[PDB]
Write a protein that binds this ligand. Structure first.
Ligand SMILES: Nc1[nH]c(=O)nc2c1ncn2[C@H]1C[C@H](O)[C@@H](COP(=O)(O)OP(=O)(O)OP(=O)(O)O)O1
Ligand SMILES: [Mn+2]
Ligand SMILES: [Mn+2]
Ligand SMILES: [Mn+2]
Length: 156
């Protein structure tokens, strides 16, 4: 059995567009991604998600809703990434570039899948249909999925 580390991922999903951030450095740099990072000691997962959204995009929200959970395994890394995925209830400010992320709005017929993590092609359509999900993806490196599982659930 493996240990897992808690991460968050936040999608600001509005009726016709979604906010994504171009990762400027670190893990997954060069790909569009939701906003998020490691959960810190003391905070709930949801509060860590709100904190990372504020740090990385400038947006301050009072509440998120859980939409999914995805476990990532990487060849050669024993620690799993346990990623808790959230969507915003509402927003009330503008996105701002941070050192980690450059935010940009994408229309929902222009989701930039080819420049996102490959797993997003599988689970992001469920998020768009407002369906909750559990996923697991094993990667060789950054590009190649060796095994994956994706299941719709009633409760995340
Ligand atoms: N395969 C994948 N697909 C995806 O859509 N998002 C992934 C992913 N693998 C990791 N992520 C996301 C989860 C989380 O939001 C982020 C990884 O955490 P980060 O390294 O961004 O954490 P931090 O922002 O704390 O890092 P620092 O800013 O360096 O402290 O990338
Ligand atoms: Mn961060
Ligand atoms: Mn981050
Ligand atoms: Mn962080």
């Amino acid at each position: 059995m493996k240990a897992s580390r808690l991460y968050t991922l936040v999608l600001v999903l509005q009726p016709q567009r979604v906010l994504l951030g171009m990762k400027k450095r670190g893990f997954g740099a060069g790909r569009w991604n939701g906003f998020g990072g490691k959960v810190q000691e003391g905070e709930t997962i949801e509060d860590g998600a709100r904190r990372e959204l504020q740090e990385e995009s400038g947006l301050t929200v009072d509440a998120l809703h859980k939409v999914g959970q995805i476990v990532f395994e990487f060849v050669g890394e024993p620690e799993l990434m346990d990623v808790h995925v959230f969507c915003t209830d509402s927003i009330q400010g503008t996105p701002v570039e941070s050192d980690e992320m450059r935010p940009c709005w994408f229309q929902l017929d222009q989701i930039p899948f080819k420049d996102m993590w490959p797993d997003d092609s599988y689970w992001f359509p469920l998020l768009l249909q407002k369906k909750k999900f559990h996923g697991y993806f094993k990667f060789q490196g950054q590009d190649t999925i060796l095994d994956y599982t994706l299941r719709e659930v009633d409760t995340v």
